[PDB]
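Re: export button greyed out
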Amino acid sequence: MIQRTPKIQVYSRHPAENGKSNFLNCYVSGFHPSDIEVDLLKNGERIEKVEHSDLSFSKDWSFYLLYYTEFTPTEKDEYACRVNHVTLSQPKIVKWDRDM
Amino acid sequence: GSHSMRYFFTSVSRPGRGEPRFIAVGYVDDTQFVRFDSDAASQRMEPRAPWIEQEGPEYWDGETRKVKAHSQTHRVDLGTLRGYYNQSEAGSHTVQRMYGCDVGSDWRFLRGYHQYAYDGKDYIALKEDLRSWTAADMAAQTTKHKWEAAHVAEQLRAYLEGTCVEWLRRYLENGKETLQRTDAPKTHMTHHAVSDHEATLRCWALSFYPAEITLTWQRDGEDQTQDTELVETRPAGDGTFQKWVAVVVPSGQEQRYTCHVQHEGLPKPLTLRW
Amino acid sequence: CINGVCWTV
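Workaround output, generated via the alternate export path:
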């Protein structure tokens, strides 16, 4: 059984500005099989209202999904994405870095 | 520029009870326009772009009938493949199918595709001539013989060169306001210091459509790939795409480095400097 | 518009 581990990027839909409504994204790609757990975190805590795209795949058969939630950035709030997959012995956490 | 229509289908078996999870999605270029999800309540092909909502109830009845048939084909396939590969009923397995057509700037047929994978591995694919098959192993060779006897390639070629390109043209016309519009990348550069002697320059491209783009660095006018990092193009979530490329440079020598951006929405490639 | 037949393996 082939198993491919997900690549992860965390970022905002629009240029992030404090007090301005936006979307926080976690893009997972390059993975197989398709079962995957993705949470968006605010200050370490799971965000409840998170949606995702319809499962699709690249030329090489690996899957990709976009997970996203509406948010208004502030100076103090920290955001991250937490991903688990059969290829990962423990969940992987990637922090949102707006200054990238 | 060129255009494409592609359909992607994934079925994942559910051992122990019931039929596979089936998800179908259709794209024109980089724009998703329809979906079917077997776990959703409607059991209909559903619109995902405003311009496809122009189609009447007859279109939706047809696409729903056909996509349900695709789901049944994959259900049968999962069982057949478990038999070909001598696998147990215990594990979940996956089938993936993709097909579609590319057209050039004149919207005339360029190429067609129809390929299939089992558990993420190539299984069988139509060759470029649309007349014969690439089978990866002996299970797929048994499928190849079956499909040759049933003249499957002939049916697919007629679809790919005919219906596929005809409906792509229709969609391109109906959705012209967005589908025929190019969104040039919006670019900027950021700078970070890691130490007193090493800096990072990151060249950003945002808000672009279609997804195809090239971002490169030069040092004193010569291509620079060493000490660079190019991330995978990613969806913004509003239908546009984003990408960046970074280079590590000696602090104080930032002026030597230039970022170069090529995209269909830019008449001439663009340059950025720190 | 999707293909009107889906061929089993």
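Chains C and A do not touch (no CB pair under 8 Å). The button fix ships in the next patch.
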